[PDB]
Ligand binder design. Structure first.
Ligand SMILES: Nc1ncnc2c1ncn2[C@@H]1O[C@H](COP(=O)(O)OP(=O)(O)OP(O)(O)=S)[C@@H](O)[C@H]1O
Ligand SMILES: [Mg+2]
Length: 527
DNA sequence: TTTTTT
């Protein structure tokens, strides 16, 4: 870690409501990841609230989406009625009564209206007038990156809540991401601000040369959902291995089918989820505390719940007597007899709707499980008790004509993994008398080789294809291209400098702030 | 042409 950075953790240590920023690449998130350790040691592991604007970027540091944390849904409604939505769910209310520090990363994507609301929700809950109820704030973004989504949106700082809230500011300088290319850093420093010359243009337009043709799948960054899907399938249908179709149950009672379709998209769920063995996926609904919107991962193989109950126990003891896997692979009546022991009335009218999802293929045969699924065991001639894989594969050949679901290896930003067999979820849009106008049961997955540029903001991409065809917001081009470590590993199609421009309030804001060294002097102000 | 909801 640098010297300019440690003066921030230690500023946040001493308890100051800092916002802190810097060019893309300057290691603000990495910094934050360690800052979060030393704020749980002050308040409590359960009293620090790690969040970001999006949900993938929120996983970059360990956190849930800011909206998921506060418990405000999409947070469109009035500032007063969000308070009563919060104080209903007991979990979310005391989550606001105990947090000592609220962390928000890539706050650039939050709009002044919500920052005003959270500020209010906290004050009326915590019984305190202080700029957020006394909650130590830590805002970490870069206002030259993507601005808050509008459907006019004032920036996070135009709010009364921000300029009341932020007590202190800092500003990092050394761009670490492209550290070995002092030229490429420069090219992005002036793409961030609005200036591009010929040598920049020609160099970027030279990057459209195809990327290396090795066995590492390059990441692709398109500005739209229907590009991201074109590339997520342009790439998936190049993967060796048998596909698995996943058809989404739909309903139920709306008449305008054009909005029905459009409603059926923003659920983040596709009508046709195609998934092979080895696809990069990303959870899209907040399921639990560590499997959330934005969790990258990979698909491992496709098993039904009877099967996966063996494979799960088989991960917890590869030194297991196989006389019990053989009791399940020669009599699968006893198989259910151990699965049930470990596990509403409107949920029983959606189980039997989710029950139909991915109908059983009693006429299609069941291919064997891959090699890599039993690699975990392969780590002394008398200990080769591995009739286990032949037992496990036998248990799989008993699940033809049974719904097989994706077993996904998920990966957190602290580098630990977690396997889960992904069950369908349900997306409904309804009214006061509960009738789902549009309802859809699909898997909470989408291919995650291509992110949007919004979702990729905050990422650090080793080999990244970028296509500036359909960018429409200031700095968005600068995000997609600055997600790159180098130039040797970067493709740039349809480079268009004729719309690469700055916003005026972003120049106006980064002239009234404290530099990296104007963070040190406030340390001897404490001491 | 975008994100956000257990
Ligand atoms: N002190 C450091 N020493 C070595 N590598 C660093 C250091 N700080 C950052 N990096 C590298 O820089 C990248 C991480 O920088 P980030 O923390 O992601 O900054 P940032 O996320 O680009 O800022 P954004 O995009 O505005 S959220 C990784 O490749 C790190 O290995
Ligand atoms: Mg980041």
């Amino acid at each position: 870690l640098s010297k300019e950075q440690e003066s921030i953790i230690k500023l946040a240590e001493n308890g100051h409501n800092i916002f802190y920023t810097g060019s893309a690449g300057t290691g603000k998130s990495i910094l934050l990841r360690e800052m979060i350790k030393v704020l749980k040691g002050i308040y409590g592991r359960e009293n620090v609230a790690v969040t970001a604007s999006t949900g993938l970027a929120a996983c970059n540091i360990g956190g849930i989406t800011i909206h998921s944390f506060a418990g405000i849904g999409l947070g469109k409604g009035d500032a007063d009625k969000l308070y009563k939505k919060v104080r209903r769910s007991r979990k979310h209310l005391r989550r606001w009564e105990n947090i000592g520090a609220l962390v928000v990363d890539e706050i650039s994507m939050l709009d002044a209206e919500l920052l005003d609301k959270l500020d209010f929700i906290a004050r009326k809950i915590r019984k305190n007038h202080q700029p957020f109820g006394g909650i130590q704030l830590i805002f970490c973004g870069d206002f030259f990156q993507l601005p808050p989504v509008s459907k006019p949106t004032k920036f996070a700082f135009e709010s009364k809540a921000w300029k009341e809230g932020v007590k202190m500011t800092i500003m990092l300088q050394k761009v670490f991401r492209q550290r070995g290319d002092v030229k490429f850093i420069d090219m992005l420093n002036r793409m961030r601000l609005g200036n591009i010359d010929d040598e920049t243009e020609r160099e970027f337009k030279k990057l459209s040369r195809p990327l290396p043709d090795d066995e590492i799948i390059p990441a692709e960054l398109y500005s739209t959902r229907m590009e991201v899907e074109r590339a997520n399938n342009s790439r998936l249908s190049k993967l060796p291995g048998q596909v698995h179709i996943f058809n989404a149950i739909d309903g139920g009672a709306l008449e305008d089918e054009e909005l029905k379709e459009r409603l059926l998209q923003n659920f983040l769920a596709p009508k046709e989820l195609h998934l092979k063995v080895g696809a990069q996926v990303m959870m899209v609904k907040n399921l639990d505390a560590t499997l959330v919107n934005g969790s990258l991962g990979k698909v491992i193989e496709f098993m039904d719940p009877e099967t996966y109950f063996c494979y799960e126990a088989l991960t917890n003891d590869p030194s297991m007597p196989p006389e019990k896997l053989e009791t399940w692979a020669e009599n699968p009546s006893k198989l259910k007899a151990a699965m049930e022991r470990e596990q509403s009335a409107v949920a029983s009218r959606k189980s039997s709707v989710k029950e139909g999802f991915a109908k059983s293929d009693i006429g299609e045969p069941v291919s064997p499980l891959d090699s890599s699924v039993f690699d975990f065991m392969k780590r002394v001639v008398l200990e080769n008790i591995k009739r286990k894989e032949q037992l496990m594969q036998t248990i799989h050949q008993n699940s033809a004509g049974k719904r097989r679901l994706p077993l996904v290896r998920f990966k957190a930003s602290d580098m630990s993994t977690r396997m889960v067999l992904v069950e369908p979820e349900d997306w409904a849009i309804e009214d006061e008398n509960e009738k789902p106008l549009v309802s859809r049961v699909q898997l909470p997955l989408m291919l995650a080789w291509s992110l949007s540029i919004h979702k990729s903001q905050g990422q650090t991409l080793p080999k990244v294809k970028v296509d500036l065809r359909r960018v429409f917001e200031k700095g968005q081009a600068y995000v997609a291209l600055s997600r790159a470590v180098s130039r040797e590993g970067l493709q740039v199609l349809n480079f268009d400098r004729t719309r690469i421009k700055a916003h005026q309030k972003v120049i106006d804001f980064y002239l009234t702030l404290s530099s990296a060294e104007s963070a040190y002097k406030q340390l001897e102000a404490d001491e």
